[model samples]
Structures are given as C-alpha cells and as structure tokens.
Target: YFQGDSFKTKSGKELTITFIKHGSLMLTYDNHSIQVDPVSEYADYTTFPKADIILITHEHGDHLDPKAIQAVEKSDTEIIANENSQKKLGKGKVLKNGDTDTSISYMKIEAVPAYNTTPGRDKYHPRHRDNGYILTFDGLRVYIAGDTEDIPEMKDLKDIDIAFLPVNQPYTMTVSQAAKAARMFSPKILYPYHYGDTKIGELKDALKDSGIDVRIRELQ
Candidate 1:
C-alpha cells in the first residue's frame, strides 16, 4: 500500500529510471523499485534509492556486488537470481529459468535465457549460468538482455517496449551484433548498456533503420 504519483521518462511516458552506474540499472514502477545486475563498489545504491527487488544476472564482479546488495538490504527486499548467484547471495529467493512468472504488486517479472554465445568465451558464461529478465509493467514489456550475444531469445521476444542491451566485446555483444539484435527484436526503445568506454556514438547511428529508438545511457 505504498502508492504514490508515478515518475515520467524522456519519452513522454510515465515511468521511473535511475542509473546506478555500469551494468546496474534501477527501475521504479508504481512504488516497486527493481535493480538489475547491481554490482558492489560500482553501484552506489546508498546514494540512490533502495531496492525492493534485485535481479542479478551473473556472478561477475561488475554484476554481483555483495556490498551493493547489503547497502540496500531491507527486510522486504528479495533477490531473484540463478542458482550460482543464489548460493553467493546467502539470502533472497532463488529463481531458475522457466520458473513461474512472478508478480509483485503491479509488476510481473520473468526470468529469461542469458549466457555467452561467443566462440571463445563459452567458458566465461555458458547457458543457464546467468539470467536475462522480462519485466511487464502495466502492459509495457521491458527486456533486460544480460551478458549475452544475439541469441535466439532476442528474436523470439514479442511486444517488447524497452530493451537494455549490452555492447561490450569479448564478454558481451559488440556494437554490430547489438545493432543486429535490435533489428531483430524491433523494440520501441533500445538502451546500449555495459559499454565500458566503448564509443556508442557509432552504435546509436547504426540502429537508425530498424524502426527502434536507440539510446546510450551513462554506464561508466
């Protein structure tokens, strides 16, 4: 029963977004706030708002920040992550892929497939070792593509309103691959995340024709 006026976005839509640095993205919708890939040290959750739901994609340094998780730890805050992350988290609910879709008040959270598809980086993040998330807010669907390449899941996503895609090479998708993935999903908006100093100016320019609004958020 923590209802309040909703926040608006630059797209003239009512939503909430506060970047927590690097791959950490905080989203608030209808009083429920969710943090995606909240890494410790990198994501200063203390400076930002608290999280009611935390989703950890993988156990990487830049994604699994124990300090960050503890900084915003609340009795009600529950974390949903893969099995490995669950073991490291020590607490929070464990959720596997294809687990039952979860509903927290006004939001619906779904765990999707996330893993490394690179030829040489297979060992870095094999399939089922991580998790991507599909958040259904009201009726809009937001896709958070965790550390993954242009896998079949991207093409299979339907009615995606907003998409947060990675653009770092050797670990995640390169600029070209991200652009290609965006073209396949054709989401309403695409945010190139986890760039890590990689210039996204070219990446934004490349996603011009897929009929999707491409943006580069500050993740450094």
Candidate 2:
C-alpha cells in the first residue's frame, strides 16, 4: 500500500474511496454513502446500497444515467449535478462552475471549471456547461476532474489531497495533458479515471517523477 488512499478526517472519522469503474465511484464516511456517476455499463446499481449523495459531473450518458440513479437513490438521497443533468434527472441540487455549497453536513463542495480548450473540441465540453467538483471534508480536499483538458483554471486549485483526472482523448485530456494538469495542482495521489483504452502506462511514466503518486485502479 504505497501511501493508501484512506484518510482520517479532522473529526476522527474515516473516509474511504471505492473506484467502481470509469466515471463511477463510491465514497463512504460517517456512514453516508456518496455515489458518483453510477452507470449501468460499469455495474448494476440496483444491487448496490442506497446512496445518500449522488453526484453527476455532466449530462453525458456515461456520467448521468437516470436509470442507474434511480436504482441507487433512496428517498433522502441528495442529488447534485450540473444544470443539464438536473434537467435530465428532473431533480437535483444544481451547482454551476464557481458555485459553492455546504448543504451536505460536514462537507463543503466547490464547483470548478471543466471544459475543452483544444481547437474543434470546445463543443464537446463548452465553457460554463460542465463542472469539476472539489469536495472538502474537514481538511482533506479531493478534486474530481470532469471531462476537461489541461486548462488554465487548474493552476488555481490548491491543496488537493486526492484527484481523479480523465485521460481519454477527443473527450478529455491526453497522457501529456493529464500530466500537465497534475503538475499544475500536484495532488498527493492521482487516479486516472474515465480513461477508455488510453494506455495509462504512458500516463504513469509521464508522472513518474512528478512527485504525484499515480494510482492505477480497475477503472476501465
């Protein structure tokens, strides 16, 4: 366990991260289950435990599956997403880029910019249409980088303990771009998720000396 991902919150609670599959993850702390992008392709949510908090990064089918949401959602599940995803899901706590919310007890969330800067790919994740979330639990900050390229906004993020960055091309960052983004924020641990067929070995090599502990998981 090269510096395991588990952490103890300021309140002495434990926070655990479970990487389910591409763009799908589960976080448990204080007995509250947080499901992020639970898609059917990755796993059948009906078989999973009810979610207390469901987070959708964007409106993309892979990131916002309504059926999967319903499968894991309980009556009190707090659904938070971008505007389009909220519209598609018919209900949610809409958080646009640059918005901050503390509705969830013991957690402060900040929505950050996530868009394509490469030419001709701007339409894929246009500016202000998508968001990458920064969840702050006590002092531990985890950045979930939604479909985005190496943009200038990344430099503004600070003190990120763990980061989940996408590396698939045409839709997200390339191996080089992912490395560059990682350099910008320099999270203590980096997990390359939402990467489809993009060789993570290259990404791992790129960050080998970057002081960022690149964690490769079963997020295919």
Candidate 3:
C-alpha cells in the first residue's frame, strides 16, 4: 500500500485519502473515517479502519459489494449510497444527484451527476441516476468523478481543490477525455484513479504546463 495523499483542511486538520485500488478509496478527516466503493478483491476491509460513513456511488459490482461493505461497517456506521446502491444494499439513505448533505458536523457532501454522455454509451451510467461526489471537508473540496465521461456538467463545478477522475475507456473517460476534464474545471490537485490500462505518464504529459498537480498513485 502507498503512503496515500495527505492535506490540511481549512481548520488545519488533516485529510488523508487512501487509494485502495481501482475505484475504492478511504478518507480520514479529523477523527471519522470514510470509505467509498469498497470491494473485497481490492483490499481486505476487515483489516482497514471501520467506516464512520460509507458511500457507494452506484450499484455496479466493482463499486458496490455486500461482503466488503459488511466488513468495514461498525454498529452505527452511516451508509449514504446512491439510489441503486441503496436498493442493492437494502438499507441506508439515498442521496440523489444535486443534493447536498451537512448532517455530519464540519463536513459537506454533494451528490453530483455521474454518467456517460457519449452516444450509445449512456447505458453505462444513466443521467441523474448515478452520482459523482463533491465532498467538502473543512473547506477542502474534493470531486470524485465516479465512472463517467468528460461531460459538459464539469463546467458547472467550481472551487474544486482536489479531483479524482477515472481514466478507463468504454465505461469511463479515455486518457484524452480525462485530461480535458481536468482542464475544464481546473482543480488544484488531481489523481487519476480507476485507470485500468491507461498509463499515468501519458496523462501527466497531456496536462503538462496546465498548472494542475497530477499525482500518480497505484490505483489500478
């Protein structure tokens, strides 16, 4: 496992993000731990920290697994999943697109639109169905583009301090589209996760001199 990315929030507290293979991520801010799209094949959830909040982006097998979710959750771990993910889990609250939640103190979660926009590719993730999350932790904005192409909706995103854009094809964005997605909103920090076959060096080359700090991690 890599050291993971660490940054300070506006409150000067640490927000550490663990890139746990593919689309799985564990974020720990203040004292609460958050897990997103945890899967068994990626990491043994039993050994990881128990989640204070778990977010399942969609119902896709790679993004939602009952076994993994069960392993990481505590007695009161709050599961905030998308509509389909919630249905598959048979529990937890559903957070739809365009909705933002502030129930957790010092944290804000915005469920943004995550879907394919290309012709004949909308079947992957239908519009207004899936979700990409904009989680704001103490003024640190993070945009996790959950399995989506570089759609025009990215233009509406503002003040994104960190971003996680997928670089896979057929289901997500290509390396070119991922590059364009970064340029669209201009996030200060970017991590190319869920990138199956796309080389990180090429993406770094594509965004050269763009002023975006692209951090390469073992996310495949």
* 1-76 per-residue lDDT for model 3 (tens digits): 5458899986789999988988899999988899999999999999988999998888999999999999999999
Tens digit of per-residue lDDT, candidate 2, span 1-220: 1122477877788889988888788888778888988888788788877999998899998898888888899999999999989988889899999999988886788999999999899889999999899998888899999889999999999999999999897899899999999999899999998999988878889988888989998775
Candidates sorted by TM-score, best first: 3, 2, 1
Model 3 lDDT-worst window of ten: 1-10
Stretches of candidate 1 off by over 4 Å are 1-13
Q: Which of the two candidates, 1 or 3, achieves a greater lDDT against the reference? A: 3
lDDT of each: 0.77, 0.88, 0.91
TM-score of every prediction relative to native: 0.90, 0.95, 0.98
On the 0 to 100 scale, the lDDT of residue 74 in model 3 is 95
Best by TM-score: 3
* Total backbone collisions for each predicted model: 1, 0, 0
* Candidate 3, superposed: residue stretches over 4 Å from native: none
Q: How good is model 3 by TM-score?
A: 0.98
**Deviation from native of the Cα of residue 136 in model 1, angstroms:** 0.7
lDDT of 1 by residue, 37-125 (tens): 87766645676567888888888888987888888768888888878988987877676776646557557778878777767788877
